[PDB]
From a paper:
An alternative, promising approach involves protein capsids, such as encapsulins, which can be viewed as genetically encoded enzyme encapsulation, and is particularly suitable for immobilization or within physiological conditions. The capsids, comprised of 60–240 subunits arranged in an icosahedral structure, engage with a conserved C-terminal encapsulin localization sequence (ELS), or a more extended N-terminal encapsulation-mediating domain, found on the guest protein. Our study showcases the encapsulation of the nitroreductase NfsB, which we produced as a fused dimer, within encapsulins.
To investigate the assembly of the Enc{tdNfsB} construct in detail, we performed single-particle cryo-EM analysis of the purified capsids. The overall resolution of the encapsulin icosahedral shell was determined to be 2.22 Å based on the gold standard Fourier Shell Correlation (FSC) 0.143 threshold (ESI†). The calculated diameter of the shell was 24.0 nm, which correlates well with the expected solution hydrodynamic diameter and has a calculated internal volume of 3000 nm3. The crystal and cryo-EM structures of encapsulins from close homologs, have multiple openings in their capsid shells, including a threefold pore and an five-fold pore. The cryo-EM map in this area was ambiguous however and appears to be the superimposition of flexible states. To resolve this, the pentameric subunit was examined by 3-D classification and resulting volumes were refined using local refinement without symmetry constraints. This isolation a series of volumes that could be categorized as open, closed or uninterpretable. The open and closed particles were pooled and refined to yield complete, unambiguous maps (ESI†). The primary drive of this is a shift in the pore forming loop (measuring 3.84 Å between the displaced His188 alpha carbon, see attached movies M1 and M2). The underlying cause of this movement is unclear and may represent an equilibrium of states when resting at cellular pH or could be a result of different packing states within the particles stacks.
Numbering used by the authors:
A (entry chain A), B (entry chain K), C (entry chain OA): 2 to 265
The structure:
């Protein structure tokens, strides 16, 4: 295939180690996939997602009405990294302390870009994020950690006024999650205080900035994937090999009233 | 379905008559479908055709390479017409001279727009025609009808220099076909003179202007259809019913050297 | 094998596309293979073709008669070309307008060299062409296109005086074939005028210069192949891949009276 892995100077065991390390880190650092419906890979031939809408266009001639079908293009994200042939070779010698830090960093970068496109928007890819697409009024996250549950209750009140149902979930930023975790009250963390309110789960969202309270009934958010995360090979040298992590995706929000955003 | 035919004041017999009359006229007046590969209807959900190419785009952030997948949108052509309820009603009385001239005119219009988009281009739909996409030099159709075969032989020489194979076919305009038909030499029409050269067929192309000599080996032209020609209903009155003929399509040319264009 | 295709950064689909495109163009531009017997590939170990003749040589010593066996060596023709990794990669994305023009040009070049060696001679390879090996007197192709059939009839008279039988065939140059095709008489091309005389076929020979009338009974011309046309890999870069088209061949003419040559 287009990955050209058979041409890389890497053994099966080292390939397995790299894949495992990247998968673990990405699954750690990814959050949107846990609260958004995912349309499984449709193949490399997939390039756009139809919206079912029509756009006006100049007719070819008299007596003819012309309309253009509307589609959302898919964007390919590629993050390159470099690995050492010595660490690669040591694996077949029964070594199991090899350095895969570039792999972990690339996985973190890819997860962050994906989550930031989902929750904030990537305009050049025509991706409007949940924050912008949300219709319910946005709130402000208090500087202190003790007042956050009140704001979350207000956001639940807003959604739950608007008429959305299903389990509710709170996605918190790295800085906010650290705050609610370190901070404590009556012998419990402010994070447990927050958890007490919702029916769903509390989720880490390091890539995003602020906080988000959203419904998970289904049918409101769609992450379309052409091809899932993959690892490939570009070139190599006497000392290093250059690889990349690739994924082709787009994001769509259909219900603007199923989420509430809180800004720092 | 979206046609809403069940709501129209028309009987099954009249529906059949209208469908038959439109199909006959369209199949008469259509030419590109006889020399271009047709990708059958893929359903109303189809909105674009992937090209497999990539487009450069600003990255979300540092260390990330971003590319956009390239697709060709589909365009919907709708031609409205009006029919008389008296002619509709007469059918169930065993009448078989009913007037379907508006149906025939609408079918002609739709065929003409389709063929003109295929052979000349519809820019607003991002459709580049065979004439523009052709790489072989264009020729001029002589005013006289006696020199046309020489120009056709020159065009065959150009294609057949360029290295294309398979049966060759000549599509002639209405004005040019009338000329070669009426004109005669040695007791045979100039059209038969033309036919003597090629291995394929001589085709009517009223919508196009000029003439075209092209190969039919396959894999060079693709007419993508989302939905084929259909007839629908908009509204009705005590005297008339308003209908439309609809089709969603796009056209792609892959080989620029498989055709030669001759301009009036 | 020596092609080293497994080392090239090309997918199976792109390999198939390149092979198909090269085969089509070569089969289009090749002519000698249609009128000469072909000895199928005998393997890479084949290096020469015995003639069964003997050559005089100085003896090792007294009372000894020494002779050397005579053989015709085989010559390997290699034509390099370059391909773009972007066009290669687009194929797996369902792209089918990729550029293979260098492939087509290399195939044309190889076909032209093969046909020119067959019909004109490649001295350094000890290949004497049909033109030189022919014993029947050579003719001159008239500048005008109207007198060519008379010269072809004269050439048939010469062969057919000399006593050769079997279907006869005319191989025409690019410039001569264009002339006889464009030129017309009594509503038929001069090429059809020519075809009327012979029992065999009229053949395109762009590589050759002039015209040739020859018999196809069999046993007079032999194209010996060690290995048929093949495509290989030399090296690659971040943007391009360097490939070559290779064939090992030689040509032998046994009957000097089975052909007649016409010079421009």
């Amino acid at each position: 295939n287009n990955l050209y892995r058979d041409l890389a100077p890497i053994t099966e065991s080292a390939w397995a180690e790299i894949e495992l390390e990247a998968t673990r880190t990405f699954k750690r650092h990814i959050a949107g996939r846990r609260v958004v419906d995912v349309s499984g890979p449709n193949g490399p031939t997939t390039a756009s997602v139809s919206t079912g809408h029509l756009l006006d266009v100049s007719p070819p001639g008299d007596g003819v009405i012309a309309h253009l079908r509307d589609a959302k293009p898919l964007v390919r994200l590629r993050v390159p990294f470099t690995v050492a042939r010595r660490d690669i070779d040591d694996v077949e010698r029964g070594s199991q302390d090899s350095d895969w830090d570039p792999v972990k960093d690339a996985a973190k970068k890819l997860a962050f870009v994906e989550d930031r496109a989902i929750f904030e928007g990537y305009a050049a890819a025509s991706i409007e994020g949940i924050r912008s697409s949300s219709s319910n009024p946005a709130l402000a996250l208090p500087d202190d950690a003790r007042e956050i549950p009140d704001v979350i209750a207000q956001a639940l009140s807003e959604l739950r006024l608007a008429g959305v149902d299903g389990p509710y979930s709170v996605l918190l930023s790295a800085e906010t999650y650290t705050k609610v975790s370190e901070t404590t009250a009556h012998g419990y963390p402010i994070r447990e205080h927050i958890n007490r309110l919702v029916d769903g789960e509390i989720i880490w969202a390091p890539a995003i900035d602020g906080a988000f309270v959203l419904s998970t009934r289904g049918g409101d958010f769609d992450l379309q994937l052409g091809t899932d995360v993959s690892i490939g090979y570009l070139s190599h040298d006497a000392e290093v090999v250059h690889l990349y992590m690739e994924e082709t995706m787009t994001f769509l929000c259909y219900t603007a009233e199923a989420s509430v955003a809180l800004t720092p």
